[PDB]
Design a protein around this ligand. Structure first.
Ligand SMILES: [Zn+2]
Ligand SMILES: [Zn+2]
Ligand SMILES: [Zn+2]
Ligand SMILES: [Zn+2]
Ligand SMILES: [Zn+2]
Ligand SMILES: [Zn+2]
Ligand SMILES: [Zn+2]
Ligand SMILES: [Zn+2]
Ligand SMILES: [Zn+2]
Ligand SMILES: [Zn+2]
Ligand SMILES: [Zn+2]
Ligand SMILES: [Zn+2]
Lengths: 272, 272, 272, 272
């Protein structure tokens, strides 16, 4: 092969591509990093034609030492990934100190990984700890209805989680830990990466009000599906609120019964 | 052939695929079972390479004895069916006691049929009785506007049916028996399968409030079209309600005249 | 060729297909007839393999004597036309008395032309007279926002036209004759065909409240574009009304100035 | 090659095509001109088979002397560009006086460039001056939510810019100069071209109320992305307003902090 025909390159294309068709990634909005194994990239090693470029990390991340990822690039449009994956994606590998990374493949013409890379790498660190290495994906998109709801709902993790759980029956089961909400922060900073990574200790979903959502999961499909579940519920809520609000909904005891049946432990603070 | 090129595999792909593009099937939301004849699958029998796996049924269903179906799998994403039908779909055949089924094809890597299988198989039983074997499809999707309306309209079969009939002229003719509404229930249970199947005795459409819709029909296109008709009307209603409500609509006598002309008998309780 | 590769078969596919992707043609909703010349079909005459079937017309239409059309079929889904044009479309030719027609090609397996055929053929008669044979297309679809607006706006040709003209600057220039609105009527009847055809004497667009729109034009693209213009304006209006209504809009004198510049004569009753 | 396989022809197709799928370009609504270098077209010169046609300019534009562009045609549908680029696009070159242009390629069957050509060429002149020749694209589309907002928001550059900046965090960084709003004007006139070009001295985005948006940028992707950013924010706002308005938003100081971090100078009048 073509590394472009690898599962993980095809995976990034399906997804940046799916996010774009959803309307979640105007322009260069949004970013997607995927943690790989050395075994994933090894069979494609003769596709690495170029001299790896080194970029230091803002802060040391020893958990991620020697770890490869595939990533979307800075300033790159989700829409374009399907047209030219080597232009728009890079395979990088964190060095043995976790002090920086080498770009092994892609990100042609001096492109570099996403400028939300701190939010990404720091959140991977927390998700690996939190899930005992199960989670491998961090996805950020500008999910339209979730964004709209941040102008309108109390920016309160419990109330926001509870509305999303009410807005589609499956939500409690897909994200029983709820949705962490940050205060608005300047994007692309270490501060926002750190705040996001802290919230990723507690939730697989983190909202950036007036901006977008970060989601974590074990696979591209599951991470995309997680965000899509929250955003579908958000879409339902936007319609309901636009119609003047709920007259009936899923009750607290129904939500509790739901969690019991599906063997999850829903965020207690959201069950007033 | 390729069984993947059979009409029924191509049928499941067109439809799980169409439902996904409609935005009705985020993540693994939704499921689709199709009742086949032995004659459908016979010409593709050398495609069955694997040793059939047996799964017992929750409750005996002798009506369905020796009956083949093609089904979407548990945890599977509608979006993915077009990319890998053998991964995401299975052909199963109910055993001669109707006490369980064998998976003949697909659902690779230990996958199993949808966990709403009770709602499906039990509803097939009722629809076969109700339609003298005409109906062959049960489709469940998360139809967005219908979901939204369950938060806002009286969860009353007559009022809900009447609004949907008003929301597009064709509705009364496509679903003269209306739309049965269940109370909210925990999904994936025998209880909800039983409640859905009871309502399928009376209606080709059954709403799961705050969740989605179940529809039944003779073919994939007709079942999809049935749900699409209800959901289009729901979409119109959501817009109308968002604009402050109706100032004029189809009257009771117009609805009655409509039913007469098209030779259907509309749900009388919905014609206040 | 393949007649399936003819301009007019490819034309019907692009359009029934485009209407479906717009969300305007759920199930079998909507229909599309296109008036052809003998010269269009002549080079494909060896594609007519079957014995033409004769169907009498409900009422005589001598204007249409010996005239060929390509048409969508009764009960057929717009969505399916691209998958199987001979199944879903027919080429018919009105007989020399205009008392009935022969199906020359397509509409396989005993299918027949659309059951709105009276609205179609009668409207073609009026549009040919009205445009000195320029108009060749009648398109009916279930345009979602236009439908929604019929529940909410005064069902008054002048007020409805004026709102649509206000809802996108181009509207007055594309449909200066406005949009005729019928009372609700039972579809598929001679009565509704006759009422629609009468309104087509005065407008290129006719609204069926709580149902859909009929549009006429010289080509498939222009007829589709006409409806799309009205429906885009309707979409804008639905958003504006959902937001609490207009605070500013295009004025009467701006509309008048617009008509003057583009050499059209806008419906005077709509210019209060 | 095929000039149809050139980057700039493929560029116009991706974009008129992308705008159409967004729902921004019903019928012939919208237009797209791209400033080329002689070097772009030189390698495809044997594709120029036809005798160039000369069209005089409404007013002299010496800045544009000898300059080639690729352009969408008058009356042409964005949707169709992908089906037949030579029908729907033209390559033109302004003559050495900037008094008129020759059509070198495309615009077959006596077609001519867009009738908003004054808004285009005059705006290119101002954008070249304003950006020291960096900007190369002028795109006009009927962006749906931005149109809707012109009926509802104060048609005030400062307030409108500030709402759009609030409606998605990235907006201030993508268009720190804001969005110039014109009064409604008759389209296709020198007057509206002149007014638009004046506003392009100050903003990369110009709104035509009740009509659409003009955007300028260095590349097709960046110009499309600019409009898409504004329109995504507009979409969010429409949802928020439909839900009864904002309860919280990005503050003035957050916006200021944002501008500082990203090294832009936001429109001060918009920072009340
Ligand atoms: Zn972002
Ligand atoms: Zn090697
Ligand atoms: Zn938290
Ligand atoms: Zn479900
Ligand atoms: Zn065999
Ligand atoms: Zn019932
Ligand atoms: Zn209709
Ligand atoms: Zn012959
Ligand atoms: Zn009239
Ligand atoms: Zn325009
Ligand atoms: Zn040469
Ligand atoms: Zn200005």
């Amino acid at each position: 092969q073509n590394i472009t025909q690898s599962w993980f390159v095809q995976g990034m294309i399906k997804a940046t591509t799916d996010a774009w068709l959803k309307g979640w990634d105007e322009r260069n909005g949004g970013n997607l990093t995927l943690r790989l194994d050395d075994a994933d990239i090894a069979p494609y090693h003769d596709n690495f034609h170029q001299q790896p470029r080194y970029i230091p990390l803002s802060q040391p991340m020893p958990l991620l030492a020697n770890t490869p990822f595939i990533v979307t690039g800075s300033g790159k449009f989700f829409r374009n990934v399907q047209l030219d994956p080597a232009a728009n994606l890079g395979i990088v590998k964190v060095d043995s100190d976790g002090a920086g990374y080498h770009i092994l493949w892609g990100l042609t013409n001096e492109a570099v990984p996403t400028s939300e890379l701190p939010a990404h790498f720091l959140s991977h660190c927390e998700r690996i700890k939190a899930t005992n290495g199960k989670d491998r994906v961090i996805m950020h998109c500008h999910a339209t209805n979730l964004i709209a709801l941040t102008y309108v709902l109390e920016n309160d993790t419990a109330v926001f989680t509870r509305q999303l759980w009410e807005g589609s029956t499956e939500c409690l089961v897909v994200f029983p830990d709820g949705v962490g909400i940050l205060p608005w922060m300047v994007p692309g900073t270490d501060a926002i990466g750190q705040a996001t990574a802290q919230e990723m200790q507690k939730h697989s979903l983190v909202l950036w009000p007036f901006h977008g959502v970060f989601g974590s999961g074990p696979t591209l499909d599951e991470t995309f599906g997680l965000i899509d579940t929250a955003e579908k519920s958000a879409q339902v809520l936007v319609k309901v609120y636009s119609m003047g609000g709920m007259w009936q909904t899923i009750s607290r005891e129904e939500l509790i019964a739901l969690g019991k049946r599906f063997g999850v432990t829903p965020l207690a603070s959201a069950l007033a």
